[PDB]
Structures are given as C-alpha cells and as structure tokens.
Amino acid sequence: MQLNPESADLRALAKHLYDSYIKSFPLTKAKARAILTGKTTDKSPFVIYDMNSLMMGEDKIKFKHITPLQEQSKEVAIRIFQGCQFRSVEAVQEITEYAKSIPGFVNLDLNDQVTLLKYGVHEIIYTMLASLMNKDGVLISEGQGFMTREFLKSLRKPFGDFMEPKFEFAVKFNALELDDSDLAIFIAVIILSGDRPGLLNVKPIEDIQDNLLQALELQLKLNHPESSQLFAKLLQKMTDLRQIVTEHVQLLQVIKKTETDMSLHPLLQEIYKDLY
Amino acid sequence: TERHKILHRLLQE
Ligand SMILES: CCO[C@H](COc1ccc(C(F)(F)F)cc1)CSc1ccc(OCC(=O)O)c(C)c1
C-alpha cells in the first residue's frame, strides 16, 4: 500500500460519502451505540417489553406518524406494522437522497437509477437497522423508544416472525464492528450493484462500483488494523442481505391475502413489486 | 408503462 494520488482520491471519496451519510441519515450508528449504552446526554429510550409497556409507550412516545385525529387498528401487531411502514417510506427517501450524493449516480440513466434504488433500498434498510439493534431489542422512533426482541417475537403469527431474521443478521453483522465511515461506503457499494435485474446501461455502473469498492477496501485496511479478511467478510454479507430480503418479501405475502386490516403504502408496493 | 412512478418522482427532484 502506497500514499499516491490514487489513494488520496479514494480517501477524498470516503470523506464525501461519510459527510453525505451524516446529513442524509438522522440516527447514525455512532449515536445509536451511545444511546444503547446510556453514554448519552439525551433523555433515555422508553422500553417496550410487554403489552402494558407498549400501551404506555404509545402515550409517552411522540411518534412522528400518529395523530389523535386519525384512527388506527385495534390490533397492536397491526399498529406496530404501520409505524414500520411509515419509517420504511421515510427510509426510502433518505436512501434516495444519499444515492444522489454518490459521485456519478445522478448522471446515470434515470431508468437505471430507479432500478438500483428499487433493489438496494431494502438491503440498505436492514444494514442500517443493525446499527440500532443489540441482542435485546431495537431502537425505534429515532431513539425515543426501545422495543425488545422477545416482545416482537411474541406478536401473533405471522407478525412475530418478521423481525427475528433481522436480529439474527444484526448479531453477525455487528460483530464486524463497522463504524459509520465504513458503513457509508458499504451502502454506496450496495446501491451500485451492476447485477440488478433490468439494468440497461451497466458499464458506467460497474465503473462507479469499482471505485466504491477500492475506497471501501482502503477504508477497511486503514480503520481495522486488527482484523484482516474484513473486506471479504463484508462482501459476503451482501449475499446474506439478498437472502433476508427475499425471505422478508415472501413472508410479506403470508400477510397479504391472509390479512385485510392493513395495506401496503404505494411506495412499498412499487418496491416489493416484481422483486425476486 | 412506469411501474415505479413514486421512486421515479423521488429521483427527479
Ligand atoms: C426506527 C423508527 O422506529 C419505528 C417506529 O415504529 C413504530 C413502533 C410502534 C408504533 C405504535 F406503538 F404506534 F404502534 C408505531 C411505530 C420502527 S423501527 C423499524 C423496524 C423494521 C424496519 O424494517 C423492516 C420492516 O419493514 O418490517 C424499519 C424500516 C423500521
């Protein structure tokens, strides 16, 4: 490894993605970890660990999406699924905004931009969800709430089966001990996968992903001295992300049909559409 | 025949 104008550009791209990632995403992994360990000056997430705490939390947590005027489901499982939809729709926009900051992305075929986003969004969602998870639960409502793994597992079928796979993945992924600087480049690599179905102008996409991939490896080598193979292990996780996405969609069909009290926001329908 | 009108709008602004 040398310090030459190539590496210097790599590091410059690294910083640009990071800066763009900080402004595009509200709750970074840096802050989530602090909250998750009390090492925070902010209040303290309200813990939802049973039905009584859920009910209480619905009052004492100001959810950005609910209002007293509107009426929501009578079934807690459905209400919780609704807030997750709202959060996912918001997540789609943060990710879209982040994508536009990736050098070159905006100058791609708009139709291909759409295709990269349709497929990358969910992988990036579960990637960044890990930042908010420990093995006990997950931060919600941008850190004002904390919902436990076991409480989510206790929702009536089939809802009690949606988050388990994500916790499973998060424990393995968080053992990589990535930080935001690593993550910023990683999700950029995900967005610019030239092997997504339906792409038309692949060449310029791979040319971007190659830069991203160089910038990532250099980032991992500089930032994780005591863990070789981190680059390979991380690429492997991109595989596992495609599997949990497939599985999530499939289970989502079990919801669909066999449920009717809720429906899927159109943005989410656009994405899940002709997915896998 | 746009199958992702919303995403398309999001990207256009
Ligand atoms: C990070 C913000 O927190 C959100 C708040 O969710 C709610 C929880 C409870 C309630 C209510 F109590 F009102 F029912 C509402 C929203 C849920 S966290 C989450 C969990 C999983 C997610 O993705 C997977 C999925 O779409 O199921 C996403 C995108 C977000």
CB A1, CB A221: distance < 8 Å: yes
For tokens 């536009």, the residue is A100
Tell me whether residue A107 is exposed, middle or buried, using C-beta atoms within 10 angstroms of its C-beta: 0 to 12, 13 to 18, 19 or more. Answer: exposed
Cβ of A141 less than 6 Å from ligand 1: yes
Residue A139: phi and psi, rounded to 5, are -65, 140
Provide the β-strand partners of residue A146: A47, A139
Number of domains in chain A: 1
CA A212 to CA A156: how far, in whole Å?
42
The domain of A255 spans 1-276
Output the six-digit token pair for A32: 């989530």
Q: Partners of A47 in the beta sheet?
A: A146
Owner of token pair 């993605």: A17
Contacts of A182 (CB under 8 A, 6+ apart): A216, A219, A220, A223, A224
Which residue reads 């420990």 in tokens?
A134
> What Rg do the C-alpha atoms of chain B give, in angstroms?
7
Do residues A269 and A254 touch, judged by C-beta distance below 8 A?
Answer: no
Percentages helix, strand, coil for chain B (3-state, rounded to 5) are 55, 0, 45
A115-151 burial code (b ≥16 CB/10 A, e <16): bbbbbbbbbbbbbbbbbbbbeebbbbbbbbbbbbbeb
CA-wise closest residue to A163 among A109, A87, A55, A230 = A87
The Cα A105–Cα A108 span in angstroms is: 5
Burial class (CB in 10 A: 0-12, 13-18, 19+), A195: exposed
Residue A122 assigned to a binding site? yes
Cross-chain CB nearest to A110 (options B3, B5, B11): B11
DSSP structure string for A211-222: HHHHHHHHHHHH
- Shortest alpha-carbon distance between residue A267 and chain B (Å): 6
Distance CA A96, CA A101 (A): 9
Chain A residue numbers touching B3 (CB-CB < 8 A): 270, 273-274
Q: Residues A234, A186: contact at Cβ < 8 Å?
A: yes
| Inter-residue contact A147 to A58 (CB < 8 Å) | no
**How far, in Å, are A28, A49, A229 from residue A42 at the CA level?**
15, 21, 37
| Record: contact B3-A113, CB cut-off 8 A | no
- Atom 26 of ligand 1, nearest CA residue: A84
What single string gives the DSSP state of each residue in A132-159? TEETTEEEEGGGTEEEEHHHHHTSPTTG
Sheet harboring A46-48: ordered strands across? A46-48, A145-148, A137-140, A133-134
Contact A45, A55 (CB under 8 A): no
Q: Do the bridges between strand A145-148 and strand A46-48 make them parallel or antiparallel, or are there none, so unpaired?
A: parallel
Closest C-alpha residue for ligand 1 atom 1: A140
CA A185 to CA A215: how far, in whole Å?
7
Q: Which two tokens stand for residue A177?
A: 């001990």
Tell me the backbone φ, ψ of residue A145, rounded to 5 degrees. -130, 160
Which ligand 1 atom is nearest residue A54's CA? 12
- Is the dihedral angle over the CA atoms A128, A9, A192, B7 positive or is it negative? positive
Task: Judge whether A248 is annotated as a binding position.
Answer: yes
Question: What six digits make up the tokens of A128?
Answer: 């960044």
A256's torsion region: left (phi>0), alpha (psi -120 to 50) or beta? beta
Cα A222 to chain centroid, rounded: 24
Resolution in A: 2.4
> Which residues have C-beta within 8 Å of that of residue A56, sequence separation ≥ 6?
A46
Q: Is A226's Cβ below 8 Å from some Cβ in B?
A: no
| Residue contact A267–B8, C-beta within 8 A | no
- Which residue's structure tokens are 């959810």? A63
Among A61, A233, A58, A79, which residue's Cα sits nearest to residue A143?
A61
